């Protein structure tokens, strides 16, 4: 019942200058220059009424969040096509980043990522927001020490292998069903990008989950870290941990990361979007 007094900035297409392509809708990269004497690295993500109705729903959610660990919208552009202008995350998504750098990611970085994602989801819970699509592919990286949650095409208030059981069976998505997807996300990071339930077809996922089976313990994980992941996968959603508790637990472990993760080897006027307020 709180008024979403967020702001939706409409941006002239002459304000930003595209440079290269990132993904193909198609995601682009460029610089947004607001008369402001400043350059901002951005990511600039045809007639289908539902394609616009969903794209603008994403822009609604991104514009209504503000947190160090949640990607925020800088604005939208209403030209021949609707564009979403967001903060440029130079290192891509965390899934690709954890796969390309398997042999240079240490326990401190892994546990720090778990804390930051739990902080991001804890903010979304403050905003009465259920993500419904938490995964390693949907967490972006601006620096190796700073990640944010993104991709709110599902967010409210199909990815079977990330959903809570109640979601797969009863279409029920709660803040606690995000905790389930969080545990799968941490599993992706602790396995350096392994596909969850690789092989097992999605037709049998809800059946093996009802049999009690979960994802195996990743090799680098002490039982302390894996216990937390297992707790995110209990059938009673209320027994699952809270994001505010996951922050506390993973932060305690980030104070001594080698005790809980056993890993072998432990332009001119440019401003960042996070300094443009
Ligand atoms: C199809 C792939 C793809 O889009 N990647 C990227 C997506 C980004 C993004 N997405 C987005 C999400 C939700 C939104 F609402 C909007 Cl508006 C945008 N936002 C910001 N920065 C991004 C940077 C990306 O790549 C970085 C280059 C690293 N690469 C090359 C070197 O190796 C490592 C990977």
UniProtKB/Swiss-Prot annotation:
Changing residue 25 to S: Found in a lung cancer sample. Changing residue 131 to L: Found in a lung cancer sample; more sensitive to gefitinib than wild-type. Changing residue 134 to V: Found in a lung cancer sample; more sensitive to gefitinib than wild-type. Ubiquitously expressed. Isoform 2 is also expressed in ovarian cancers. The modification Phosphotyrosine is found at residue 276. The active site is at 133 (proton acceptor). Changing residue 8 to A: Abolishes phosphorylation. Residues 16-261 form the Protein kinase domain. ATP binds at residues 22-27, 45, 86-87, 151. Phosphorylated on Tyr residues in response to EGF. Dephosphorylation by PTPRJ prevents endocytosis and stabilizes the receptor at the plasma membrane. Dephosphorylated by PTPN1 and PTPN2. The record marks 276 as: Important for interaction with PIK3C2B. Changing residue 65 to M: Found in a lung cancer sample. The modification N6-(2-hydroxyisobutyryl)lysine is found at residue 45. There is a cross-link at residues 20, 37, 50, 53, 211, 242, 252 (Glycyl lysine isopeptide (Lys-Gly) (interchain with G-Cter in ubiquitin)). It is found in: Cell membrane; Endoplasmic reticulum membrane; Golgi apparatus membrane; Nucleus membrane. Belongs to the protein kinase superfamily. Tyr protein kinase family. EGF receptor subfamily. Receptor tyrosine kinase binding ligands of the EGF family and activating several signaling cascades to convert extracellular cues into appropriate cellular responses. Known ligands include EGF, TGFA/TGF-alpha, AREG, epigen/EPGN, BTC/betacellulin, epiregulin/EREG and HBEGF/heparin-binding EGF. Ligand binding triggers receptor homo- and/or heterodimerization and autophosphorylation on key cytoplasmic residues. The phosphorylated receptor recruits adapter proteins like GRB2 which in turn activates complex downstream signaling cascades. Isoform 2 may act as an antagonist of EGF action. It is linked to Lung cancer: A common malignancy affecting tissues of the lung. The most common form of lung cancer is non-small cell lung cancer (NSCLC) that can be divided into 3 major histologic subtypes: squamous cell carcinoma, adenocarcinoma, and large cell lung cancer. NSCLC is often diagnosed at an advanced stage and has a poor prognosis. Binding of the ligand triggers homo- and/or heterodimerization of the receptor triggering its autophosphorylation. Heterodimer with ERBB2. Forms a complex with CCDC88A/GIV (via SH2-like regions) and GNAI3 which leads to enhanced EGFR signaling and triggering of cell migration; binding to CCDC88A requires autophosphorylation of the EGFR C-terminal region, and ligand stimulation is required for recruitment of GNAI3 to the complex. Interacts with ERRFI1; inhibits dimerization of the kinase domain and autophosphorylation. Part of a complex with ERBB2 and either PIK3C2A or PIK3C2B. This is Epidermal growth factor receptor. The gene is EGFR.
């Amino acid at each position: 019942e709180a008024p979403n007094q967020a702001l939706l900035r409409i941006l002239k297409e002459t304000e930003f200058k595209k440079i290269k392509v990132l993904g193909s809708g198609t995601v682009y990269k460029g610089l947004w220059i607001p008369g402001e004497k400043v350059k901002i690295p951005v990511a600039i993500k045809a007639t289908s009424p539902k394609a616009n109705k969903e794209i603008l729903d994403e822009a609604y959610v991104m514009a209504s969040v503000d947190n160090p660990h949640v990607c925020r919208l800088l604005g939208i552009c209403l030209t021949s096509t609707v564009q979403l202008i967001t903060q440029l995350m130079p290192f891509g998504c965390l899934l690709d980043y954890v796969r390309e750098h398997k042999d240079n990611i240490g326990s401190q970085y892994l546990l720090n990522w778990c804390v930051q994602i739990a902080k991001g989801m804890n903010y979304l819970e403050d905003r009465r927001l259920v993500h419904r699509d938490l995964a390693a592919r949907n967490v972006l990286v601006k620096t190796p020490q700073h990640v944010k949650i993104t991709d709110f095409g599902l967010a409210k208030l199909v990815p079977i292998k990330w959903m809570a059981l109640e979601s797969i069976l009863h279409r029920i998505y709660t803040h606690q069903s995000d905790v389930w997807s969080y545990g799968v996300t941490v599993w992706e990071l602790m396995t350096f990008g392994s596909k969850p339930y690789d092989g097992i077809p999605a037709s049998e996922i809800s059946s093996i989950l009802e049999k009690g089976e979960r994802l195996p313990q990743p090799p680098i994980c002490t039982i302390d870290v894996y216990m937390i992941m297992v707790k995110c996968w209990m059938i009673d959603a209320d027994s699952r941990p809270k994001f505010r508790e996951l922050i506390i637990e993973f932060s305690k472990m980030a104070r001594d990361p080698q005790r809980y993760l056993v890993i072998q080897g432990d332009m001119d006027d440019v401003v960042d979007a996070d300094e443009y307020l």
